[model samples]
Target: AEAGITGTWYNQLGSTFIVTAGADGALTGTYESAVGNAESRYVLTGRYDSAPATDGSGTALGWTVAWKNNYRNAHSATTWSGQYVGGAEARINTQWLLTSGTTEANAWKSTLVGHDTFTKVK
Candidate 1:
């Protein structure tokens, strides 16, 4: 329960991701990126369907943000797939892929991928 993926999380880049999970597994959140779309809030919707780890870690949670505002061009959206690991230090290990709303030639330039370890805020 304490290890549930329903809290504030921060990545190394200082971006903040907040999660509000429902009893039926529906998820909603806000994401403020530190890069590109810095300082702006974006809406996110996702869900966690996998079973939790024996140690209370959550698995198979994913979310997406269809960015708006100024930095919307480079990448139109990003989906983050993550797993929550709990312990004295709780964190979400995530892999994110950013997709571009552009042509193949230009798409290659904007398509981005990265990973981040998001620590839960106390």
Candidate 2:
């Protein structure tokens, strides 16, 4: 399941590199911002939890990601915490809120970004 998540993710805002955990337990991944075009990368490590729904429909999944960018670079570590609801390929919403700190100087940090209805990638 994690292998499928290894790639780049982009939206209207910008693009982000994503690396998921391997079959073995280890913190090995990198991510970079495509918006700034800067030679900066972020080290990412996180964990996820998924379980069968109590109602016997699908699974519920959530993740807590921690990251760190190049020092003194125009970057910030952001955490995304959300859950997947309903059956697979139904409607999954992942809400990523900029809990604290600033991504860049004097920039309006995002308090939260919610994917109201994001479908699973098969």
Candidate 3:
């Protein structure tokens, strides 16, 4: 719930990204892979709910984003969840999972994390 902070963030592997809150109801985002094979280009939209931080600060922000399998449209899967470092800035250790079902607990054993951070919406 941003609580007070608001703005756009960036990423390295995405074609586009945006987030907004404050006057809005909840954290909303839309990310796309600008260019990709008609069936390979994957995109997702979801909310950034507060989550627990591994740092033990007890103030971490976690989230759940769902992406269509494209060909499957039925299958599913970031504000940029993390502590607002200061003045429109923050850093978070994020991960991407290829869940085939119930593998959420063992994903790390086979998946690799895509690391990045968030900053002022520019």
TM-score of each: 0.81, 0.48, 0.46
On the 0 to 100 scale, the lDDT of residue 4 in model 3 is 34
Model 1, 32-66: lDDT tens per residue? 88887544888899887755456664666888888
Residue 56 accuracy (lDDT) in model 1:
60
> lDDT score of model 3?
0.43
Q: lDDT tens digits, residues 1-122, model 3? A: 35433445555544444555424335555555433222333443443444424454423344444445445342334223344443334534344543333466765564324545544442
Candidates 1 and 2 compared by TM-score, better number: 1
Return whichever of 2 and 3 wins on lDDT. Answer: 2
Clashing pairs in 2: none
Clashes of each: 0, 0, 5
lDDT score, candidate 1: 0.77
Question: What is the lDDT, from 0 to 100, of the residue 13 in candidate 2?
Answer: 42
Model 2: per-residue lDDT, tens digit, 39-106? 55666665544432456443333443344445534333455544434434344345554434555874
lDDT of 3 at 31: 55
